[PDB]
């Protein structure tokens, strides 16, 4: 799997399906949007519906290796109910290509038996804080359940259930990686303490990205590729960490080194 180790990432491919549109939380940084040709983490081409998900991942394994297909569609792929009619249809289509998911968490306590059921391998979580303190100024609202909460009650409901789905889904059996976005200011002497807690909770590797200022901040400045070295050798002395991220877009297909993007 390219998303793990850091060696076959410039060797083996993965797809990525525009199958998840609108989300149940809003970040800090968010744009999604269809930009065409950027290469934001949400800035799909052009969405996609899971038959003609399907029809893709069909015609680009013949023409690419293609080892994962992952659902980082723009919103989370948890929110969208068209991923769980993809990984259904293509569970019986192409049982040979492991399935990955992006989500943000919220919704992995009521969906771990679903994930289970689907055939899901590996599931990165989008953990970016654990203290309150942190986290209340990082997200705006999260609609969860029938009830919308917006201040420090909102990072509350999401770090639970995000924390207690990473728990549930480790005890099923499946790999989970760690997302969290460096922003400087804010979480830059907190990222250990977010690799205690999910190491607590069964995280397997954990891939610290470097914040992108392109979203409702004021374009804070990115973390140095020191500082983002800094704090990557601290964390990996608690967990395996990873070193190649690219900050795909949601519609990449092919080997991150040549991939396309609709
Ligand atoms: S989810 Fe993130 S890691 Fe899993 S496949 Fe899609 S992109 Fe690679
Ligand atoms: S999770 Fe992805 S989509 Fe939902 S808000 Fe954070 S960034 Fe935008
Ligand atoms: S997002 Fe980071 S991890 Fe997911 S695929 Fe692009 S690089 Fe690999």
Same mark, same amino acid.
């Given at each position: 799997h390219p998303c793990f180790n850091e060696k076959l990432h410039d060797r083996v491919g993965r797809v990525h399906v525009p199958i998840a549109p609108r989300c149940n939380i809003h970040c800090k940084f968010c744009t999604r949007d269809i930009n065409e040709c950027e290469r934001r983490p949400g800035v799909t081409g052009r969405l996609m519906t899971a038959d003609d998900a399907i029809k893709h991942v069909e015609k680009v394994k013949e023409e690419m290796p293609i080892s994962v297909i992952g659902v980082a569609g723009p919103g989370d792929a948890l929110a969208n109910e068209e991923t769980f009619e993809f990984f259904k249809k293509a569970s019986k289509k192409f049982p040979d290509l492991l399935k990955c998911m992006s989500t943000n968490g919220l919704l992995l306590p009521d969906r771990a038996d679903e994930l289970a059921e689907l055939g899901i391998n590996t599931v990165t979580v989008t953990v970016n804080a654990v203290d309150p303190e942190i986290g209340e100024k990082i997200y705006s609202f999260v609609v969860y359940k029938d009830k919308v909460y917006h201040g420090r009650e909102a990072?509350?409901?999401? #770090?639970?259930?995000?924390?207690?789905?990473i728990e549930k889904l480790a005890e099923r059996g499946i790999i989970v &990686?760690?997302? #969290?976005?460096? *922003?400087?200011?804010?979480?830059?002497?907190? *990222?250990?303490? *977010?690799?205690?807690?999910v &190491? &607590?909770?069964?995280? #397997?590797?954990?891939?610290?990205?470097?914040? *992108?200022?392109?979203?409702?901040?004021?374009?804070?400045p990115r973390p140095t590729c020191e500082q983002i070295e800094r704090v990557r050798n601290e964390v990996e002395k608690i967990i395996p960490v990873f070193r190649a991220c690219t900050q795909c877009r949601a519609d990449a297909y092919g080997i991150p080194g040549k991939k396309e993007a609709d």
């Open positions: 990072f509350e409901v999401l #770090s639970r259930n995000q924390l207690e789905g &990686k760690v997302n #969290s976005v460096l *922003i400087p200011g804010l979480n830059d002497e907190h *990222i250990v303490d *977010i690799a205690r807690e &190491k &607590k909770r069964g995280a #397997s590797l954990m891939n610290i990205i470097p914040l *992108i200022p392109m979203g409702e901040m004021k374009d804070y």
